[PDB]
RNA sequence: GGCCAGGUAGCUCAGUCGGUAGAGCGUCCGCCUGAAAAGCGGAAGGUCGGCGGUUCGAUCCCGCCCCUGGCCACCA
């Protein structure tokens, strides 16, 4: 339910591109891919809701 | 070229007919050891063979195609 406002969404768009912008090495990148975009983000977990 | 069964993680496989997909071993971390492994605890890792389509969304539905194993067939 709220998980799935596009304020909730924005919510988690604005913190997965924050923390890709702010990764300066290929190895910081996969690590926030994993946090941001992996099977347990906020992204995730509304697809799966 | 024919028939059957398949292609899912680094290896060996289970599974799923629309929104979470997994095990054993392999990888990484913490405690631990002088350093290890085991044990205990915790992570990463898959374009689910490919390209189109359908769909708000496809490992899963439709189309085309590719490869793997087995049994045939062919032959210097
Ligand atoms: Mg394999």
């Known amino acids: ?3 799935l406002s ?3 969404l924005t919510t988690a768009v604005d913190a ?3 923390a890709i912008a702010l990764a ?3 190895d910081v990148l996969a690590r926030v891919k ?3 975009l ?3 983000s906020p992204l ?3 697809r799966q809701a």
Do not use: S
């Open 38 to 40: 992996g099977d347990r």
């Open 16 to 18: 997965a591109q924050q």
């Open 1 to 3: 339910n709220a998980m």
């Open 24 to 26: 300066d090495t290929l």
């Open 6 to 8: 596009p304020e909730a």
């Open 34 to 36: 994993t946090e941001h």
């Open 44 to 46: 995730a977990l509304a």
